[PDB]
Design a protein around this ligand. Structure first.
Ligand SMILES: C[C@H](CCC(=O)O)[C@H]1CC[C@H]2[C@@H]3[C@H](O)C[C@@H]4C[C@H](O)CC[C@]4(C)[C@H]3CC[C@]12C
Ligand SMILES: [Ca+2]
Lengths: 133, 89
C-alpha cells in the first residue's frame, strides 16, 4: 500500500581551510521502509567547477518513533568526473565504503506536510530542511 | 547522539550541548537579524565539535542550508556573523 514520498534539498559546505566549497544536492525517495537516494556534489576549488561527484545509495529506513529513524544502506556507489555528462565509476574510499556498516541516525526535529527538519549523519552531525514532493 | 534543543526564542532554534553558548548565539542572532530587517519563518542552528550548520526557512522558498567546517573553535560572534552573511548573500 505504501506510496512513494519524495524529498529534496541542497546545501553549501565551506571547508575548514576555506580552499574549496561544495554545493550539494540531496534527493531521497521513500516507499514503506525502503529508500533510494541520489546526491550530487559540485566542487568549487577556485571559484570554478573543477570536480563533480555522484553518490547513489539505497537500503532500508527503519522507524523507531515518528521522530527517530535510521538508514541501513545495502550499497553506495560513487561516480566522478570533471563534466556531468561523462561521469566514471570511482573506487569508494574505505571511510565512505564503511557508511554501510553503521545504522545512520536521522532525528526529526520538525515535521510538516511540506517539509521536514532533521539532524542527520553527514559530517557526523548536520541540521537541514528537506522539502516534500 | 546529536545535541538537543538548547535555546529557543521566536524563530530561532539552537541545537548544542553548550547551554551558555546557545543563549549567547541565540540573542546575538536575533539582534543581528533585526538589524538587517531579516525575519526567517524558522532558523535552525546546530553546533558540533568540528562543524556548524544552519537551515534558514522562508515561506514558499527553498530553505538556505549551510555547513561550515571549523578546526579552530569559533566564538558566538563569529558564528552569528557567519550565519547572517550566508543568509544575506
Ligand atoms: C569520495 C569523494 C572523494 C573523496 C576523496 O577521495 O578525496 C567524496 C567527495 C565529497 C564526498 C561527499 C560529501 O562530502 C558529502 C557527504 C558527506 C557525508 O559525511 C558522507 C557522504 C557524502 C555524500 C560524501 C561522500 C564521499 C564524497 C563523494
Ligand atoms: Ca558500492
Amino acid at each position: 500500500q505504501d506510496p512513494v514520498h519524495f524529498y529534496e534539498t541542497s546545501y553549501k559546505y565551506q571547508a575548514a581551510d576555506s580552499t574549496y566549497m561544495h554545493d550539494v544536492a540531496i534527493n531521497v525517495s521513500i516507499k514503506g521502509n525502503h529508500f533510494t537516494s541520489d546526491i550530487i556534489i559540485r566542487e568549487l576549488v577556485k571559484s570554478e567547477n573543477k570536480n563533480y561527484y555522484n553518490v547513489i545509495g539505497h537500503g532500508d529506513i527503519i522507524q523507531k518513533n515518528t521522530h527517530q529513524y535510521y538508514l541501513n544502506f545495502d550499497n553506495i556507489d560513487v561516480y566522478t568526473g570533471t563534466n556531468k555528462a561523462n561521469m566514471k565509476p570511482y573506487k569508494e574510499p574505505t571511510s565512505i565504503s564503511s557508511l554501510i556498516n553503521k545504522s545512520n541516525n536521522i532525528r526529526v526535529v520538525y515535521l510538516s506536510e511540506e517539509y521536514v527538519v532533521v539532524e542527520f549523519f553527514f559530517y557526523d552531525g548536520q541540521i537541514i530542511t528537506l522539502h516534500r514532493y | 547522539d546529536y545535541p538537543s534543543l538548547s535555546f529557543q526564542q521566536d524563530y530561532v532554534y539552537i541545537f548544542s550541548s553548550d547551554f551558555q553558548l546557545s543563549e549567547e548565539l541565540g540573542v546575538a542572532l536575533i539582534n543581528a537579524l533585526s538589524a538587517k530587517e531579516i525575519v526567517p519563518e524558522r532558523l535552525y542552528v546546530m553546533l558540533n565539535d568540528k562543524t556548524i550548520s544552519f537551515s534558514f526557512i522562508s515561506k514558499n522558498k527553498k530553505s538556505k542550508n549551510r555547513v561550515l567546517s571549523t578546526e579552530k573553535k569559533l566564538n558566538y560572534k563569529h558564528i552569528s556573523e557567519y550565519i547572517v552573511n550566508e543568509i544575506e548573500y
